[PDB]
Amino acid sequence: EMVRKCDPHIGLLHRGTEKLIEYKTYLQALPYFDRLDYVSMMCNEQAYSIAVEKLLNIQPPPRAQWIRVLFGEITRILNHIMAVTTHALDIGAMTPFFWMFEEREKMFEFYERVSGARMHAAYIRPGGVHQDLPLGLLDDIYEFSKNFSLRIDEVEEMLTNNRIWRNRTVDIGVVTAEDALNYGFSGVMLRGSGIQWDLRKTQPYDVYDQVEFDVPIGSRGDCYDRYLCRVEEMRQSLRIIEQCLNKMPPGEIKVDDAKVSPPKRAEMKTSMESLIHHFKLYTEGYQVPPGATYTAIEAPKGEFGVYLVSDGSSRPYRCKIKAPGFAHLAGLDKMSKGHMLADVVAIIGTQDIVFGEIDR
Amino acid sequence: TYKYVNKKEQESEVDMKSATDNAARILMWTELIRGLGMTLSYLFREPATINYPFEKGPLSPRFRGEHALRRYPSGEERCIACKLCEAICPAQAITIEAEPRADGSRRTTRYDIDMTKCIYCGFCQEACPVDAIVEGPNFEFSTETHEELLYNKEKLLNNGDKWEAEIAANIQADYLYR
Amino acid sequence: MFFINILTLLVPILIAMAFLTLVERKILGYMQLRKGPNIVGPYGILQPFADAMKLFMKEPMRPLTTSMSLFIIAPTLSLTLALSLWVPLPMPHPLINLNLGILFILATSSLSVYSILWSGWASNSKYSLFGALRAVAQTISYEVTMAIILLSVLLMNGSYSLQTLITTQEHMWLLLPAWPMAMMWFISTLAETNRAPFDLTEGESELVSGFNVEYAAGPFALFFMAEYTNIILMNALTTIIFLGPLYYINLPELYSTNFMMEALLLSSTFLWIRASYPRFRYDQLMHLLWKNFLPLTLALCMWHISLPIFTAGVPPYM
Amino acid sequence: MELVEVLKRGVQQVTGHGGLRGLLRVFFRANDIRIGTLVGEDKYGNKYYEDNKQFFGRHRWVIYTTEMNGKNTFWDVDGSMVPPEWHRWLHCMTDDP
Amino acid sequence: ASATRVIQKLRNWASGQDLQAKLQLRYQEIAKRTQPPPKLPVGPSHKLSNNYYCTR
Amino acid sequence: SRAEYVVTKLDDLINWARRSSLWPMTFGLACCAVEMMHMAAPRYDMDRFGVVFRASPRQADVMIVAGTLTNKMAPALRKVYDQMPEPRYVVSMGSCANGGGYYHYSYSVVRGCDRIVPVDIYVPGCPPTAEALLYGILQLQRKIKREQKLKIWYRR
Amino acid sequence: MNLYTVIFINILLSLTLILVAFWLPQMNLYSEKANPYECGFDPTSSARLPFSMKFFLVAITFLLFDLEIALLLPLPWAIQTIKTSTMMIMAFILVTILSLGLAYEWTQKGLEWTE
Amino acid sequence: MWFEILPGLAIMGVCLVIPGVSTAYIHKFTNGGKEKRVARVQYQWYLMERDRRISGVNRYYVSKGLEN
Amino acid sequence: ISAFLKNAWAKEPVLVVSFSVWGLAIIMPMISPYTKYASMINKATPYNYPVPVRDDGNMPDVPSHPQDPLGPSLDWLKNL
């Protein structure tokens, strides 16, 4: 009942999203990113949007960036709830799941009030953001955030000082820093081994330089350290939501350049220029210049990356998507050495694993 | 800035009191009675569940669900076969085939939506220049046949004539944002 | 009239199993911030009957790789032992007055293991065999401690008869003399019956329903109700041994009522424990139940041998 | 004390649906008794009650009919029978029935 | 909100901390569902003068 | 009174049993499974209806295809559907499984689970709200309620 | 015969129940449903092959400790003897010997599993 | 709410109470206003076999007294 | 060694309890005065008939009847 070799045969959520993206426009291709990592939706489309903005040499405005980082941290709390509670289900503890999926339902209500979809909101666009958030929503995010600390404290009371959780996560999945770097890990799988690295700090992409928070780092590369790191990332995302609420400046939410981002619905019904631009944007696209980029963000799993290749056309020529989870699964066999089937189950749960990005 | 989560500041201070406290943590499962008490607290709370068919989940006007083809207040058909709802549809769900109507009007002879290809993205309704096709509130249109979920002009117009009393209100609420 | 007695002992135990399933689901629900079944009956008091009927209408699975004899015979044995264990139980006057009741219980349970352990082999598959070997490890872990705990506890009762514990506890409980033995007995009853956190044989996230992955219908139902019957049995044993209720020779139904109360409390405690904690590992269970429970168990057995003597408290042989 | 007051509230719940017939007609049919304010009755039979002292999934609810279009929905109930005028208020897109 | 003041005590003791103030549910402290209409603002490049697309 | 009436009421009973206790499978492939979890979650609790998961397909009465079905994962789906013991039902959940969905025209996608398993009920969405999946499950209950098997057996 | 009767009753309950479970329902058998599970895919080999057990030493010492139980279990009758010193010393010796053996196994890493 | 669990608990308790009171009353009914005799040693069995052979009817539970 | 036991009461307190209870079980029988009444009580129990004895004419200390003064007065078992 102990493992001598692991050969993950992924390929069962391989659809061909990259080829379909080559066949679609830059706006048509956006929901694929919502659908790749399907518990951290807005972060994937944030990455895509940043890449296309870089190719366009265009920046979004302050308000759009602020609500973008706000919903990025909301996605972090989503996926960390997901990862922690699924890891616990695997290990046997099932009550955090039901305690926290109510909070996830509230978060989905935020998504459905902002967009009209609980999960696959195509809200982060290349040119800023689609739709301005409604009256009376920051109050609700505040009312949620003031109590989520109590919720996460309940979970932490259940299964941090426990003996079964400790005995079942500690000295499990131990990774050296050199092994992590060479195998290609990112995010929490680095910070658990003790590598001070976070792109929100080193390569800030929307407003993260303008907002303060701390990066949890672990001293042992066991599962317990990179469980507490996720818990503290949830707390720090809450700390950042506080700031993003306290400053959310007024102004346009999308780039005021109607050759990239579509105009107002009434502006396209009194002006001919903006109607032409509506037409071409919503039928042809906006013709990003040639070139290429690699842009990466801290997805809640790690370094979600997109290598776009372009041309004068309104479509992309290549879009590879780096999946944090690809390299983690590659390192699965290394991390499970002298361990058992149950400990391997825990190691699967620890990587924050999801296969829409891996297979894609 | 960073911070350690599981790094002891320093060790090597123990007396018989701390030993007693640790040995009573052990041998009494004291950190497990806390979990028992937590689950006991949750037994005496109001559960978050709802009697679904009789009381339901909260939605917003922006919610995007079943589709519909709308009309003007005069009853005139509002689509004009500008054929860009299918240009942008990233699933290739929409087809149009259009002709003059014998009144001398740009109108459709076809408006199909394979709702088994639709991803419910809203691009069609934010691309239509006349607010003709919308994505309404109905999420309770499950079927026992694949062929029922392949719609045409008549089904979409039935939806519109059904859900206009809701869609008009949702649009009235959500415009000034779109 | 003995057959009517069999009825009054057997059918209510089966209804108790059936409604324990409901109570489990609803308690776990409310701990999980939800309402369990409240639809099929008024408050869901028909879901067990629905489950049973639906299970007995499903087509049973006779695989090709299987050994059909052991396959069909293991659930039979499981329920038969789960239902024969209730026989000597004094509540307060038993159905069958044995002089070595605790040995009957011990042997019956050590044989109840073989249901799991032959169903898993007969069901020729991998996760099935994993569940079987995990059952072997579990029994290796718990049987020694169960026996020596029970010895130390009855070493102040004077006999293996279950009915003598009622007079041993006429003015007190055996929980205050032996709360440590009671702790370890509780957790060994938790390791027995394959109940969480010591489940480790239908460990749905480690194994895909071990020793039942190939069982579908009424056979699986038999395993189910055997488990949920042994739960109530072990709670009844804990409350007959340690939580001794009041006999009152004129009022024996009082004994029966307090027995009911304490058994329900301890069963709800099992469900509570399922809801609260994660699962052990079947090697960590060995390490626990050999390197923590067996030392203290032997030490306290020495103590309980000394104690009748240096206190002049040697009990009577009837 | 307060135990007696919650028992009184339960007595009111038991005794605010007509009688035994009217109580069972709601209890076997919706698995709830909670009394609220009648917002309005529909042109098919639906009732659309309300009680804002509850939380934000139960402050509004429906009690369906027993015959909508010759279908006998006394037992076979479905959410497709809420027309759009009340769909909007029931799914909480409005505070305006 | 309705916990009869002794079950409130039980749950606040077993938990470890006051949770009647920080509840999992929502009663009246939420942004209500029908709202006033907005007037969304208008970004720069609406200058009406000294704004040519070749410059920005 | 009549044998046919007795048969009708017996069938009502067996349908009530199979309807009030249908045990789905832990079989979710893609995003739609997250909304299945949310249905399992407190707000739209499934166990309220007698709908609790079981991991083995032999202790299961229904399978919910909550995700995209690929050419590499179709044999496994069919093995699982086969291993399920009859009476058994299927719920296709999401556009990716009703039809091919957003991945209809791709090389590694089957354009509907209709081609591999027989579907009883189709739930649309990308994703379908767990509210909607719950509606579809109750619609499957209603479908079981009108099976009329022993009736037709008597009429053979 | 009372006990024989109770056990026969339980036996016949179980067998009647299995008879019902098998001959009441409907059957649609075919080779693709009657073959072992292995999670959707097919097995790569048989399950009637060696499963290396890594706690065999623990199993054997469990057997010896079972015998120790069998020796300790006469104590409730051994206590009503007149001596009450020989039995004390001998039970002390037995338990202490068992504990010594457990300690030797523990220190020699017999309770650890064969990785 | 949590008081919606008390029905199932009540059925469970009413079902667990019956095996005891039922056994007690069946014993008293067959043996007759008397607890069912325990015979743990051969002496008690001797007493019961005796009382059987005293009765005139093969029943150990008639309790002939000082009318002889 | 006091420091060693101080360390072991924190780390591994299960074996400390075990050795303590073992030594206590061995030492406490040596201490008590009630330890000797156990054999005497086990002896007092008459599981078998006290067979009478023939009057040789030289049995003064042996009683002629159950409730005579002679023989072992079991009043030490009373009010123990």
Ligand SMILES: CCCCCCCCCCCCCCCCCC(=O)OC[C@H](COP(=O)(O)OCCN)OC(=O)CCCCCCCCCCCCCCCCC
């Ligand atoms: C007069 C002088 C003589 C007196 C002599 C008496 C001296 C005092 C004796 C006290 C001894 C009490 C018994 C303690 C046994 C447990 C031993 C122990 O150390 O805990 C075992 C286990 C270890 O946990 P761990 O943190 O890993 O430490 C081990 C490091 N080697 O930890 C565990 O077991 C936890 C895993 C099991 C979890 C199961 C869930 C438990 C839930 C609690 C329910 C409690 C209800 C009990 C009610 C019983 C009623 C019958």
Ligand code: SF4
């Ligand atoms: S975009 Fe609107 S008007 Fe144009 S074809 Fe589509 S529905 Fe008709």
Ligand code: SF4
């Ligand atoms: S919502 Fe999106 S996928 Fe669906 S029909 Fe409209 S454009 Fe196509």
Ligand code: SF4
């Ligand atoms: S239909 Fe949409 S939500 Fe469902 S699996 Fe496909 S992409 Fe994901």
